């Protein structure tokens, strides 16, 4: 949710 994931 708040967790960041880089889409690239």
């Amino acid at each position, epitope marked *: 949710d708040r967790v*960041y*994931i*880089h*889409p*690239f």
Partner: antibody, heavy 120, light 113 residues
């Protein structure tokens, strides 16, 4: 080794279509994001398309150049990373490597890279 | 947007030497809520697909030998190689993954012999 059998591509006339078919195997395809990178004979590399996994509703990012013309697409069950080229120009001529690359990491595995030619 | 510039474009060296490349970014690549420098380094052997060498600016890819050491943060990232084996001949590129991708011009490594 994790392979990436990339059938498709060859000589095509300008304004014509085409649709490559990257079929990888060796890792868990449905869970990883894929990409398509091209290389104009001689020059460097150029990222062209990206389709994020099911987890992110098959999100897609297209480089500016191929925008509104190319359509990356996948089919998890058959491990098929497709790409629909339309309104081909002379520039699009080149090698189209198909590579898998997990979110936020690196372009882990590059395939062989089929050829594509656009000419009258 | 992100425009990568390498230097030197061409470099010649003899077997067994410390070669240093260089990649300079237009916009910062260090991500705030990740503290990672999304900048990778790939090499392409003549007549082969690009092979990954370094990611996150310093982390080495699986199976990549010790010879290759990525370095840098922000915008001035450097690729460094020690004991350049003959086999090291290929073109070296630096891509960016901060916001989409923008491969670098490249750097051809020729072997003086």
């Amino acid at each position: 080794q994790v392979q990436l059998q990339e059938s498709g591509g060859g000589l095509v006339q300008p304004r014509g279509s085409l649709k490559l078919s990257c079929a990888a195997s060796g890792f868990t395809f449905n869970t990883d994001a894929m990409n398509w990178v091209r290389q104009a004979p001689g020059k460097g590399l150029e990222w062209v398309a990206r389709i994020r996994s099911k987890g992110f509703n098959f999100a897609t990012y297209y480089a500016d150049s191929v925008r509104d013309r190319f359509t990356i697409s996948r089919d998890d069950s058959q491990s098929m990373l497709y790409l629909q080229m339309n309104n081909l120009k002379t520039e699009d001529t080149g090698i189209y490597y198909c590579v898998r690359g997990r979110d936020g990491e690196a372009m882990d595995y590059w395939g062989q890279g089929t050829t594509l030619t656009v000419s009258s | 947007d992100i425009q990568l510039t390498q230097s030197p474009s061409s470099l010649a060296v003899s077997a067994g030497e410390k070669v240093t490349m260089n990649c300079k970014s237009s916009q910062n690549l260090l991500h705030s809520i990740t503290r990672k420098n999304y900048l990778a380094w790939y090499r392409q052997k003549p007549g082969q697909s690009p092979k990954l060498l370094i990611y996150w600016a310093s982390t080495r890819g699986s199976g990549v030998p010790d010879r290759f050491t990525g370095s840098g943060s922000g915008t001035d990232f450097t690729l460094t190689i020690s004991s350049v084996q003959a086999e090291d001949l290929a073109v070296y590129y630096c891509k960016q993954s901060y916001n989409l991708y923008t491969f670098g011009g490249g750097t051809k490594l020729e072997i003086k012999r």
